[PDB]
Design a protein around this ligand. Structure first.
Ligand SMILES: [Cl-]
Ligand SMILES: [Cl-]
Ligand SMILES: [Cl-]
Length: 163
């Protein structure tokens, strides 16, 4: 584990992360997809061998010795708010189990279901709070990746408020 486990946020492509493993915002079919998923496919294509997994779950595939944890958040265009909220919380709980099993000291993670699976809604607080609920009991250093400048400021504020 990290000596003083922390949360940090960076505004840049998660495919350039400086952590021991990455979480992909995957689709259930293991397809290249769009957004974070497509960047992950371009950087670690070998990790998409048998990466298909249901909504609300995470499945890790190695690219060399580097773990890619494919976490499938719900698409809020298809799910109700209640069911989607439950599956989004579940995907993050599965990421925490995988990070613990892998024994890594750090993990790069995107906010699941905030892009094309958001159903056109701002889900920063919803998704980030489910990330904290799952990851708080782990001792890995967590680095959250985002692309929007206003989202970077809001995620940073939420991290600092709890310290
Ligand atoms: Cl970048
Ligand atoms: Cl998304
Ligand atoms: Cl973003």
């Amino acid at each position: 584990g990290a000596m003083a486990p922390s949360y940090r946020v960076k505004r840049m492509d998660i495919a350039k992360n400086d952590e021991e493993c990455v979480v992909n915002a995957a689709n259930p079919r293991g397809l290249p997809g769009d957004g974070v998923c497509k960047a992950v496919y371009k950087k670690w294509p070998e990790s998409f061998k048998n990466s298909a997994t249901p909504v609300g779950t995470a499945k890790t595939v190695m690219c060399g010795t580097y773990p890619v944890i494919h976490a499938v958040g719900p698409n809020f265009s298809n799910y109700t708010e209640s069911e989607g909220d439950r599956e989004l919380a579940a995907a993050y709980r599965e990421v925490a189990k995988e990070v613990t099993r892998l024994g890594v000291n750090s993990v790069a993670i995107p906010l699941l279901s905030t892009g094309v699976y958001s159903g056109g809604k701002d889900r920063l607080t919803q998704s980030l709070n489910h990330l904290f609920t799952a990851m708080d009991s782990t001792d890995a250093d967590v680095v959250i990746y985002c692309r929007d400048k206003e989202w970077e400021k809001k995620i940073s504020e939420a991290i600092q408020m709890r310290t």
